[PDB]
Ligand binder design. Sequence first.
Ligand SMILES: Nc1ncnc2c1ncn2[C@@H]1O[C@H](COP(=O)(O)OP(=O)(O)O)[C@@H](O)[C@H]1O
Ligand SMILES: Nc1ncnc2c1ncn2[C@@H]1O[C@H](COP(=O)(O)OP(=O)(O)O)[C@@H](O)[C@H]1O
Ligand SMILES: Nc1ncnc2c1ncn2[C@@H]1O[C@H](COP(=O)(O)OP(=O)(O)O)[C@@H](O)[C@H]1O
Lengths: 366, 366, 366
Amino acid sequence: ALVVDNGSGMCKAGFAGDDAPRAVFPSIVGRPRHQGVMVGMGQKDSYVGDEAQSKRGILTLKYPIEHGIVTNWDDMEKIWHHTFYNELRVAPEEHPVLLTEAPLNPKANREKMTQIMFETFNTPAMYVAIQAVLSLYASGRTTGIVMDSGDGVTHTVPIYEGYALPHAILRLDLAGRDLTDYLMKILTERGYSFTTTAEREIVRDIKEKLCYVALDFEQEMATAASSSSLEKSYELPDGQVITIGNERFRCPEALFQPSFLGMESCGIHETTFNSIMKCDVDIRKDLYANTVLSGGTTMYPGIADRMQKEITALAPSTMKIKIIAPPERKYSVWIGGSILASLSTFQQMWISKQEYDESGPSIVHR
Amino acid sequence: ALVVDNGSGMCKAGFAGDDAPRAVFPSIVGRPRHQGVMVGMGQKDSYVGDEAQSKRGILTLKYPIEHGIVTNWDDMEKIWHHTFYNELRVAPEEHPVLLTEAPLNPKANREKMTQIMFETFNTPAMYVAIQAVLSLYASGRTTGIVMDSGDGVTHTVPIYEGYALPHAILRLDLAGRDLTDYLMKILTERGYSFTTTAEREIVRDIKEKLCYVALDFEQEMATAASSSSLEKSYELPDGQVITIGNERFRCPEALFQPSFLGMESCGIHETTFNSIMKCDVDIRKDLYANTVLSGGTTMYPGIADRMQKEITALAPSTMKIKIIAPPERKYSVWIGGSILASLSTFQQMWISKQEYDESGPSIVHR
Amino acid sequence: ALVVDNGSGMCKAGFAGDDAPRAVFPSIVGRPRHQGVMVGMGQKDSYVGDEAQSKRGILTLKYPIEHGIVTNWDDMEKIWHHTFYNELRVAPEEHPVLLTEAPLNPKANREKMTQIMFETFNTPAMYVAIQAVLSLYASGRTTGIVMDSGDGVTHTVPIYEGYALPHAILRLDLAGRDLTDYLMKILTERGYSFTTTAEREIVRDIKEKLCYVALDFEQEMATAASSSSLEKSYELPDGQVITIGNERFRCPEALFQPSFLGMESCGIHETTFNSIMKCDVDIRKDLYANTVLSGGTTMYPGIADRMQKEITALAPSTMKIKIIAPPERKYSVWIGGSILASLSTFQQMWISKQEYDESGPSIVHR
Ligand SMILES: Nc1ncnc2c1ncn2[C@@H]1O[C@H](COP(=O)(O)OP(=O)(O)O)[C@@H](O)[C@H]1O
Ligand SMILES: Nc1ncnc2c1ncn2[C@@H]1O[C@H](COP(=O)(O)OP(=O)(O)O)[C@@H](O)[C@H]1O
Ligand SMILES: Nc1ncnc2c1ncn2[C@@H]1O[C@H](COP(=O)(O)OP(=O)(O)O)[C@@H](O)[C@H]1O
């Protein structure tokens, strides 16, 4: 059977019988912005991400998912069309599929999602699972608190002996692009300017390479305020050199104390302590030492030490805390998806065509 | 033969050929309270005490006995099923069994109880004995007044030269949970709150460790009202510290003058003097100096001196009084159960299958 | 003399010489969250509710009372300072004061509460009264069971011939914010999102207008699941339309069977019958037909039928039941406060300056 994650900002897909996905691509949809100056087929009406990332410039770019909510289904159908016919070379009527979703999301999302999977692709069977649960599958633990943070969404689920406390789930719409744009805003301080969608991807790729979190914002600010050398140069695709200095960490700092982004909620560490504090007293000691980090926005170096230092300064003393931060976190959700698809006991749970034909899309509520 | 005490709040059991029981556990039944977020067998439909106390949190807790009356036989049967097959590793058709009961209890309780032991477990023989009598076996006396007090029940039986005076027995439903909840009510004075079945057991464990009886309630109140140090800290399972002060003794005080719990009966010492005053005049001098305390709710420090001071101030002078408070009172009842099962003269007293098959359940009255 | 109710979520105050209070406002404290871009005095360091609700947005909001416990005295002092100097234009040395409180609350609350009224405002005299008793004054009955439920607190007191049974009082911390968050949680089903303190008040105002309790949750669920028209539109302050449907009653339902909020206690109707069952038998016929509802969280339409249906299905038959639901329930408590202050016989009960100067703050325990 086939496992697809349409989680925000990049689709990942392959056979469930494997350890890693087969395709990984930006899910961007792009369209031409000028008339044709020379005759030929070369100008197709639309390009999907794996071409859309190459020809970027003459394309505008739109993201069909924002904050984990589909904004334009007609784009998404094109994306799935690419994933099925062009990449995995597989007929979707042959294989069952399961899909990721964010934990809290407008139910209409599920309804149309499964409607498309039946009424167009004629797929045999379907299931929608929340990402944090699947993340636990990849570690193979049965107790812990999962933190996942992707393009535009963060959430946490506490689970104990395989039971979630639904009253304890939180959203926090802080991550991803909402963080990337803060690098756009501050990078204009040095004078470099970046204005447009095709050009935003350069700043994203910088962020993907040259960023880390300070073990104390105050000391590293005082450091870079001194004449000490901490900057690294970067070269733009045109060969313009950039120097970035005093700013590789003042960016991700805004993931904490997020008043920089103007929000006034709690931040990541607050929300990790506040979720456990919605758990019963006798559970708490067991969720500590089992904070699991997940999703690509945890791949900054230094998050582990910062987070443990913060929580240990915030939680009651005498309680040991241990963050399970493996490598390969970028794949963890899909890895867990692969695991669940293989367990034979799960095979009764797929929604059948027969069920959809009685209940229609709302069957997703069982 | 097998010895089981199903007295309130914890079952105690083992072979009669021993000095102590082999298993002692809280007899609580607990059930899951959320739908499953993760696949597996791990969540069985029900847990008996030895797990139900451990995994508490995701469990709610119910007591199948309350105030000494069985509320749901199907729960008790589950408890016995665990005790027989998993714990004592014994086939019930092989061995006789005897059961404790409180002295006054609705007879239907006995009827169904023994019915289950014959018609389901196919046990060879059965006998029901009152707890105070078994308590005397452990001391090996033939004269005295037994005071037993457990979760939710207290009673006294006078026995003289091995004869009880059934017209002099009294119940007083004051002890145990009825006292523990008064710590729940009062502990909120400092501000801490405790609301649910899994969480009540924390207050029970506090009571089991940090409680004592004042050698004069009035002086120790005046003491703790001054800035003298008498409080002890306790750490909760989450590592929250608790401070308890002025209440390690204001709790068990309510076992006397129980107007604190709003009841208006007599208290324990009253009921010990009033029961003896139902004895004939010529018995009294022999019951004095033979008040035997029994049952775990007597395990507070200070009970001995308080009780003797009260009775000696209340009884007529020139009459010697001596409270026999041995150790192992937590086991005293089961010890006495062990003794009676071994006495060869008793071997005629078991109710046979033949008797139940002639008389039916009322055979329990012989 | 002055009557003040600092019950959670809004202060209410005025002269005892009246039928209703003169000022009623949300007691929220709010503070600026950006540096000043324009010159003037207009930005004071802090705003109390009547501006804090108007200018909300540029303010963050904190509630100085939570669950009936003061969290930051320096905030409360700001609220009382406003109520005395700004609103009532009154010197506190002129008039005695009485204060509402919840029935069970950490005694330290009283000590500091009365300390402030003497040592700062130099008021001549003080008394603290529990809200339910004052509620009975407004009806003028002398027998009944009072149910009061306000922002964040519920409690009940049985009173018979002017005597309470303190051992039968219950708290249940279910109401208020704990309900508001359930509207926040469920409203995201339609897709709307609400994240911040200033924005929470919009969801509160929705709750104040478009909500009712179902005479059977099951039938009304099946009804709204059909294509029948039951939704109502609401307009946001920006003119964004909201549609709410199939959810105007699934909110207050969680005030019963509150497992929706993940709590595992009993709910309101259970706890109302269970409090009476701790009363003596001969009182019961008199507490029935005298359940008096009080506090603003009783202002839902439909409460009467649900409550009467529950108790009548639970209580023994042949027993008359009558819910006294007057209008003006939002003021009943304060009305009674005004009454008690007026009875000349009550005029001996105020704690004098002389007593506080001997005993200090703990004099409130007499
Ligand atoms: N090297 C990196 N450093 C920081 N952030 C990264 C890095 N690589 C990827 N990311 C973040 O993670 C995103 C990749 O997709 P992601 O959101 O992890 O998928 P999923 O939604 O499955 O977690 C990127 O858009 C970026 O926001
Ligand atoms: N250390 C302790 N201190 C005070 N009370 C205790 C302690 N241990 C047990 N208890 C009381 O005794 C109960 C244990 O069961 P118990 O009532 O002794 O059984 P039985 O009814 O057969 O006597 C506990 O629920 C508690 O009420
Ligand atoms: N129109 C309304 N509909 C439903 N509930 C309301 C309404 N107005 C007020 N409330 C409830 O009552 C609260 C107002 O304060 P309240 O709790 O009545 O004070 P008190 O604690 O003295 O009763 C609001 O927070 C809200 O919970």
